Write a protein that binds this ligand. Structure first.
Ligand SMILES: OC[C@H]1O[C@H](O)[C@@H](O)[C@@H](O)[C@@H]1O
Ligand SMILES: OC[C@H]1O[C@H](O)[C@@H](O)[C@@H](O)[C@@H]1O
Ligand SMILES: [Cu+2]
Ligand SMILES: [Cu+2]
Ligand SMILES: [Cu+2]
Ligand SMILES: [Cu+2]
Ligand SMILES: [O-]
Ligand SMILES: [O-]
Lengths: 489, 489
């Protein structure tokens, strides 16, 4: 019964009514008030439930990220209803062309409750530092940044791969709203205190529902996950804590497998259009995207304990011409749960690769990783792999540069029928990669003095199912980073 | 139709007839003769089939070891039939009490073809150097060594765990017959040229068939494997090589999933008794073994590139009294395929543990690893884990000492409902182990500054299914050996 409307479609009467509910909610000091419910997410760190060894509860970098933030938005939405709201939490279609922030939350006049919040526990107001690139975005060919990343989400047809693209898209808006401020959307510890937090996650949830609709029409799964399955079964925190959640309906219904189905929670959206496009038009756009070759930088990411922007530059094999290829954001915090996607975040680099006339095996990378506050990030990112998606292909080609001391993702999960190809980044790798057949043989670099289950350099191989424990053809190289686990379907 | 008889039950007429067939076979220089078929196994290294990067074909340390050696014995058996034999390959029940080697192959008189073989390609006679401990075995309580290891095989009720005990049992006879000689049963490269090789593997195959019968009566699998399933589907080498196998029936039927069923190959045994015990008596003996607590040293082994004997000594936590606890053999070769059981070889140490009055968490280990030729082995074995099997228990308790610089198995596979317990071997480990949730988090030692999915020290936990990526509670300790993957059912 609670309809979520786009912020610019709210009537004056509706905007004022929900603003009045938020004011009442923000002035509610109980476990049902704004400060306590926002506190589910990061500061003050509400988990184990009792213990004094506390850490932020929100799930990121993991397959239940969407469920966690879906339920958090539901929690805030029911709290606003308990304080008089008659509508759902409004959303912001941040895929649209834009020259300013919507007034509903960007206009401070008349003590707008959605403009900022005074965090009582730390005696700080939330801040924003809006990156004007929002109004002037880079393009992937014809498509503006945020809109293209949203199309990339909708192209995915399996849940755990969807989730990576979904979360990285959502990270961009966090970074672009929050900027350098600690008590901002940039920070896992404090982002949930900005009233725009709930609007952004109401926007993101709409994309998840749209994806679920696409999956239904594809006859692919939309109410179950293809990974982390044991974990989909456990109630989420702190929603399940009696000391922390006075909303019994959400406390009882906090299991991700339940949260898959949003209809159980009595909300819907005014419309599902992106850039004026209904689902039929989006299906046609997604199909158009299959008509040309695409090349991606495939990042296999793990946690870095601080929010940062990754800028990606490419160059060919000689000492010559470097081009900026794109960027994305990673959220993080010093007390974050350890996370590792083990799946590819695909940054489309097609136009830079073509401009530099590089063949797949020639693409080399350089990253600048900078925290939200300008501090350089010391945690090293592995270089991305090269993902080649031919025009109308059913399977991607994963191109993997290897060399002594060149870090690989420890593990990457790929669809059955994915093709892979190893190529040397320097002359240290001068014989075929080998498949050792076990975790232990790879960990101990038990590599035989002969060629064995070989992946010849610069040859393409299809992988079908199971685990591949691939290393360089010598023990010493295997001990110098040249090994990884390819896990298939 | 080909009956395999115990060597001491052969009539004089039968022994002479099969000896005449072996003589003819040994003098056959073709691809169907003794030297070429024995050459399947190690020297001269017959695989890839064409390539000049050759290595020995026999599968060891892997789940298809039994299939490979079953088919090899079938290959030799059909070759002997093609040279006039009317019986199967005889076997030697080496579980029996014994004061000498059976005359059928241990008596050199009258140019006995089974006594030794002249390897034409290297111009060497096979040698034996029989360890007289065969006639004077250590005991596990009341049970002599080889007989007890055979009972341990028959106790297993799942295939990949069966296979570890099965192969380690078979290794003991290799080491005890071969001794220090290079051209002996001690060596993967040359053992197959000793005519006793086929007799030993005819003995071992009988135990596999007996186990398959037990599994049938248990309504547990006996024609399929519970691991390495993709690999059970591919034809074995060099049996599938046209240039190497003129026996079309074995060439076509070389897939392990087919070889599971020995009836397809038209042989059987005169009887299945061990130590005079039929299968009903063995079931009662196996049940008796469940009546008392047992403690095992659980070795999780990987390849060491040479045949060796492992001697195991235990002592408690202080500087005091050490006791010899048992020993076993590992076969190997410099060109062996890389292998890793990732499952527990259980060496029963109950009596030494009780003699020293040690609690589970106090048991400490020292190994002496010595190659068949007396050279000390430089490849380090991880210390075994401690396996506690309470009297009538359905699940084992795995006790895992941990500490800075103390090597663990990289991965261990255990049955669902196995209990595990971590205990510090020194004070470096002074907070709970943690479960990180991914291969990558473990590989990169992404350990959070708080307690997380904790395994408290000296507490017992049951594990149910899936993968556990367990590390010490600090990044630096995780980087100093204190991590492992526990893979469940
Ligand atoms: O002038 C620099 C800047 O100007 C405008 O804002 C846009 O056209 C941007 O793309 C460009 O980067
Ligand atoms: O005398 C040493 C030696 O003697 C006999 O052979 C047996 O009783 C052995 O167990 C013992 O080790
Ligand atoms: Cu969050
Ligand atoms: Cu968020
Ligand atoms: Cu062998
Ligand atoms: Cu053998
Ligand atoms: O978030
Ligand atoms: O063997």
């Amino acid at each position: 019964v609670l309809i979520r409307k786009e912020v610019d479609l709210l009537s004056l009467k509706e905007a004022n009514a929900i603003k009045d509910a938020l004011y009442k909610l923000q002035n509610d000091h109980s476990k049902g008030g704004f400060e306590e419910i926002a506190g589910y997410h990061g500061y003050p760190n509400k988990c184990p439930e009792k213990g004094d060894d506390k850490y932020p509860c929100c799930v990121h970098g993991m397959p239940i990220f969407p469920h966690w933030h879906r339920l958090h938005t539901i929690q805030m939405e029911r709290a606003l209803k308990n304080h008089g709201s008659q509508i759902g939490i409004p959303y912001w279609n941040w895929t649209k062309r834009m020259s300013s922030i919507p007034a509903f939350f960007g206009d401070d006049s008349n003590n707008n409750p959605f403009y900022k919040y005074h965090i009582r526990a730390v005696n700080q107001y939330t801040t924003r530092d809006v990156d004007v690139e929002l109004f002037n975005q880079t393009k992937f060919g014809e498509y503006d940044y945020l809109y293209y990343l949203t199309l990339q989400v909708l192209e995915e047809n399996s849940f755990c791969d969807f989730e990576v693209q979904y979360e990285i898209l959502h990270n961009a808006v966090h970074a672009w709203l929050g900027g350098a401020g600690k008590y901002s959307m940039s920070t896992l510890e404090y982002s949930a205190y900005d009233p725009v937090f709930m609007i952004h996650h109401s926007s993101l949830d709409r994309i998840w529902i749209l994806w679920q609709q696409l999956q239904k029409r594809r006859m692919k799964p939309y109410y179950a996950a293809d990974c982390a399955g044991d974990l989909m079964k456990f109630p989420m925190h702190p929603f399940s804590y009696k000391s922390e959640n006075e909303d019994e309906f959400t406390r009882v219904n906090s299991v991700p497998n339940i949260v898959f189905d949003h209809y159980k929670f009595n909300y819907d959206y005014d419309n599902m259009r992106i850039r004026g496009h209904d689902i039929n038009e989006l299906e046609a756009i997604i199909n158009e995207l299959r008509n040309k070759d695409r090349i991606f930088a495939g990042f296999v990411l793990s946690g870095i304990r601080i929010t940062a922007t990754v800028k990606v530059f490419i160059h060919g094999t000689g000492a010559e011409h470097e081009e900026f290829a794109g960027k994305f954001a990673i959220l993080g915090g010093e007390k974050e749960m350890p996370w590792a996607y083990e799946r590819l975040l695909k940054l489309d680099i097609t136009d830079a690769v073509h401009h530099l006339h590089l063949k797949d095996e020639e693409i080399r990378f350089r990253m600048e990783v900078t925290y939200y506050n300008g501090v350089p990030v010391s945690t090293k990112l592995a270089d991305p792999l090269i993902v080649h998606r031919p025009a109308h292909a059913s399977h991607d080609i994963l191109v993997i540069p290897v060399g002594k001391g060149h870090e690989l993702p420890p593990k990457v999960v790929v669809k059955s029928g994915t093709k892979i190809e190893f190529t040397p980044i320097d002359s240290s790798v001068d014989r075929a990669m080998v498949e050792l057949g076990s975790f232990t043989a790879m960990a101990k670099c038990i590599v035989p003095p002969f060629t064995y289950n070989a992946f010849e350099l610069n040859k393409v191989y299809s992988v079908d199912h199971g685990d591949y424990y691939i290393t360089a053809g010598t023990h010493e190289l295997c001990e110098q980073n040249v090994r990884l686990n390819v896990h298939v379907e």
